[PDB]
Symmetry: D2
């Protein structure tokens, strides 16, 4: 059991299972994959769809006729399998020209080229039916303080995203943008390093309604942050347009382990939250089968992503549906948390002696929150030890 | 030299130099300080002002006549010294009643009390002439996933800050709020953990213009983030209402070292940025003289805060004024970074073959950024080795 | 099920369930516990024993007759319950006198007093039948570079532990020492910050056979290290004299969550390793029920420690006993890892053309390690989803 | 001024200035350097010598006649410049064959090949006159718990280093080994992750006198550890055979910034310690000019390494020579720290009522350590603000 169906809306980047295993200290351990083969293998595993960087689908420098042929072949594999392309993105990090950034490169000519490169792939994403266009500004940032005036850079980042929003509007496209934060790597510090920074930035754009976030499990964890908390704030803001699922073991390089690996309990609380909130977007895995693996290991790792989600979905749902858990939630006053503090209004609060003059703070203080009992119920449910 | 004047607008919390040295593993190493004595000693050192939590100035549980006497004495020390009170805040973390939070406590009665406690001290802050009212929600958060629905909690946080904004408006007060992020400690994860999260949250409040951030050097660093970058985004947003200066050595407990200790180069880039941006608010130190110290060490540590700022101010200004640095900034294209990418507009960008069709990416790529030469000029300036 | 028995050798410090909830930002949330009550409650939960700091059992400053009475009462609770005292330790961190350390305090008189304090409690530990005497040098370290010459300090640390070893030898005691590393907190950096540093240090003592390590889950994790790896090296060295079990969520302050909380998968691999290696010492919990909790929460949290160990023990054993797992381990060549590289000796290795001249590196490289399939089997076993 | 001379014994790896700028997200930004050119440029900058991996000097797969020619040319550049080769090492991480390790690869045939590869380059290192042979087991470790039995792996690591020690002994070579710890990257966790673990491991080898450590600034910092403390323990053990100098900004990927960048104050305390201890080995930089740079930036960055050391050497020496600093060190009792705790012996300590019975702990406690005043003197000296 825990067999995925395309109805689970599990998606994978071409660059995930297609990662050849090059890391900063070693050569490739696997040959390149034909995107057509990935589409087929992923479909067989129960995937709903795939995603791509322009340069994953179409090799850098391709001529227009090479371009069409790559696209034609990919389109046939999609038609052959029933697979979808719900999201696409631009590679503004691999080519040396982007060594100081794309949209916030100090060189003006590079920023212009980065926008043109982007715009080109948005048209293709729309043609393949993508609803979301991701941006991961991996090269936007610095290793040293003087190299990047961040206020100027944010000015340039806003300029770029506003122009993209003008473009999609002018073309009548329904696609929306999702900004993917990362705190560092490959730059020493990257701009908009967390969900928070991305969310705040978007509120300064000309048409904020066109932009949301694409948070990645591992990236927030690289800042030691609580990824379920960040997702909750994103949901609260109405800005969870897409998500990247994977695993990460602490504050270190971006590991991109399969989903469920890494911080297992955070994975549980994440699935709990996504299902509870009714998140309806793709369940996208941005991961890398470890370079220790051969192609059988690649597909095993991809299957594991999906499996682990489905297992965690079952355990979270059983947790929430358990009457003993519902009673614990009441004992911990989660029901009170959801009630307004002062629907009676400011003046009635000021006039309420039960809120200050006659508040027994010592009796309130004495009330245990019973959070450990609640958390052991969650643990027992996660491990199937009820 | 590097003698501070009250015109430098250096301020200190009563709780900084007054910290008795209790930590989670040890008892107090210093006696409590009378706020009157701190005002006097700080004034002698060249401080401009002091700040306070309600419970620092007035002991918890004080009767109204004890309250007035505490206030009267403090007011006399201010009058005696010419010291100001530019900021104040509420203690919503020490009393056991706040063990699950103030504004986002699961218990509704506690949330109400937290608002009343806050409102009371805002009136006093206004009387003492404070322009900024800080909120550090140190207890807002969780140790376990089930204990806190973060969407409900953010609903309650918004409710609380909106009511405070309604209150100050109804009283015609000119004071503004500054939210102070911290990613963890004392809660396992704290809500609005970074400048980003705080900035984004504020855009959801009813009158966002009333709220900014009070970022703390050490807190952002506890998330491994670049504090000068975060300050830049805060400035970019127009939301740097206040700042907390101190030192931190990496991702660990909140150390609250004196300013300049910790990450020395980040301190330099921070001062560079504050002075360059014309930040005009207090230069506030939220720090703790290490508990190894006696009272002479306390005042030495406080003096060091101010000294280090002034030294770093001198070095940053010399860096920026150096013609050789100005030429390096041009060689690294910082001048281009400040120019709009495409003031010519979207269509002209789309029509510009120099931006794509005829862009020589390999020539662009070949251009070194010369950032290391620039950074060694900054290093030489910092260390006075030019 | 997953009911502990005293035969599981689960032990708890008096200071764990007795922690009143004081943290650096808040007052106590629970009253002090009588050690007699803790012994009784723990026994009821299935604990095997308790541990203590001198100052937990006997209040600082107690007179000899107060001392005897405290001891007499404790001894009656042990007799009443069948509970044991397998380990004890000294408090060289709470009293202000230890603000710069115990054994490595800059003040010579303090170092002498720290040794006398220690020696006194070793005699009591022996009387109560302890086999292990722990040392956690929480105050040994620095916040600044000039304050502590580390070579001099290590000289003093060696001097102290050698004198303790001379003492126990001179008294014919069979007790052994276990050094407990912590990388920071409460000092900015603490000496012997990891298992590694402790292990290396011990090899410089006069009678190294008398000293091992007492690693703590959360402490190594505070350095972002892999606690199962560290335990393995400790076991490899023959130096795992004791262990502290708890949970920690990343690189931050010492959280001391209940065992199984924090990094759940690391807890699984840890239990796997302890059981597989035949670790026969106490399963000791150094934890803190969160200060959100009342006394019912304290005992629930303590029960959870034990429960989670037993659940993880069952899953690890089923993993290792699973024939499909045994085949995967062979496919991943774990059997080869356990074979000597070159039992044939150096010259035969040099003479073996299969090892270099005629080694097909490309064929070797092409062999996938099949580690992901193995790890998903471990995941399925952990979550009971086989 | 701050002009290096070859007498400063500054050395650089061929792979540092020769790094082409490939990172996990981007292609090379600089062409490959001929080792002959690096030798020449480095010599011009004031370098004393260079170091190499076998595969840096001789391309993988080179035939014996290609080998000789590469070596001949390199030897001519050394002769031409007066440059030395004090250290060499083996590349056991780049080739896919090493994807699960060299000495601790699960595959036995790979471990054998890794030893042969190593032995071959030791003979060449000796011929070029190297005194130290470094080992960085970057691939030794795991991403998942079941993939690597660490006790078996350490057995294999010991086997490998013992065989290497047998080899150099059998050849009468005077070269010594230096193990270079790294906590993670490229493996999820790496074996012997810190100086501590390496030091402890060495004490289990057959001829421990042949092995020391080669600690790297950035690597220890990747574990949030205090690199000057670790170096002190290495020196204390007599095991600082070599060192790698660079910069790192916190717990993240291995940045390999130029020395002095990163944690500037740690760089100061490090230089203070090396000079104070009389470290006489190479001052080796294992760094990477950021990929933003062209070749002029590469040489600027390399020059900066040397400059920053010399500036920090001058400031540390002035700190220590300052009579006001010497008085502060006495006020902080650093002189007492260096005195034995109890040269009078155990019995006299037990008999000394001044050490316990009549020790005034409250008076001792009341004595401030004056560490902040001392640290601001160090700060003033570092910044040239005395
Ligand atoms: Cl913003
Ligand atoms: Cl928000
Ligand atoms: Cl050692
Ligand atoms: Cl060892
Ligand atoms: Mn990632
Ligand atoms: Mn991603
Ligand atoms: Mn702080
Ligand atoms: Mn603060
Ligand atoms: Mn702990
Ligand atoms: Mn412990
Ligand atoms: Mn490195
Ligand atoms: Mn190195």
């Amino acid at each position: 059991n825990y067999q995925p169906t395309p109805e689970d809306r599990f998606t994978f980047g071409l660059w995930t299972v297609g990662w050849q295993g090059r890391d900063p200290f070693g050569d490739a351990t696997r040959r390149a994959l034909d995107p057509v083969e990935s589409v087929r293998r992923l479909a067989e595993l129960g995937a709903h769809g795939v995603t791509f960087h322009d340069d994953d689908l179409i090799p850098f420098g391709s001529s227009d006729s090479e371009r069409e042929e790559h696209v034609k072949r990919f389109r046939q594999a999609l038609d052959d399998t029933g697979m979808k392309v719900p999201m696409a993105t631009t590679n503004l990090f691999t080519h040396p020209v982007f060594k100081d950034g794309g949209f916030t490169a100090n060189d003006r000519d590079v920023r212009r080229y980065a926008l043109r490169k982007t715009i080109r792939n948005i048209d293709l994403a729309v043609e393949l039916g993508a609803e979301t266009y991701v941006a991961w500004g991996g090269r936007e940032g610095a290793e040293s303080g003087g190299a990047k005036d961040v206020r100027d850079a944010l000015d340039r980042m806003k300029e770029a995203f506003d122009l993209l929003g003008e473009y999609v509007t002018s073309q009548g496209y329904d696609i929306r943008f999702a900004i993917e934060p990362k705190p560092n790597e490959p730059r020493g510090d990257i701009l908009l390093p967390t969900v928070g920074h991305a969310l705040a930035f978007i509120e300064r754009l000309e048409r904020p309604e066109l932009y949301g976030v694409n948070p990645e499990v591992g990236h927030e964890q690289m800042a030691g942050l609580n990824f379920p908390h960040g997702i909750a704030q994103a949901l609260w803001a109405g800005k969870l347009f897409h998500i990247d699922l994977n695993g990460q073991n602490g504050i270190k390089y971006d590991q991109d382990l399969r989903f469920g690996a890494g911080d297992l309990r955070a994975a549980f609380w994440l699935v709990d939250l996504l299902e509870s909130a009714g998140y309806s977007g793709p369940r996208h895995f941005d991961f890398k089968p470890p370079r220790t693996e051969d192609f059988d290991g690649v597909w095993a790792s991809a299957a594991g992503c999906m499996r682990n989600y489905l297992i965690l979905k079952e355990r979270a749902a059983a947790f929430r549906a358990d009457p003993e858990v519902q009673e614990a939630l009441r004992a911990s006053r989660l029901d009170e948390l959801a009630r307004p503090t002062a629907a009676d209004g400011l003046q009635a609060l000021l006039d309420d002696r039960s809120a200050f003059e006659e508040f027994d703070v010592d009796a309130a203080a004495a009330r245990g929150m019973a959070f450990e009992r609640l958390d052991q119920l969650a643990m027992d449910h996660l491990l199937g030890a009820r």
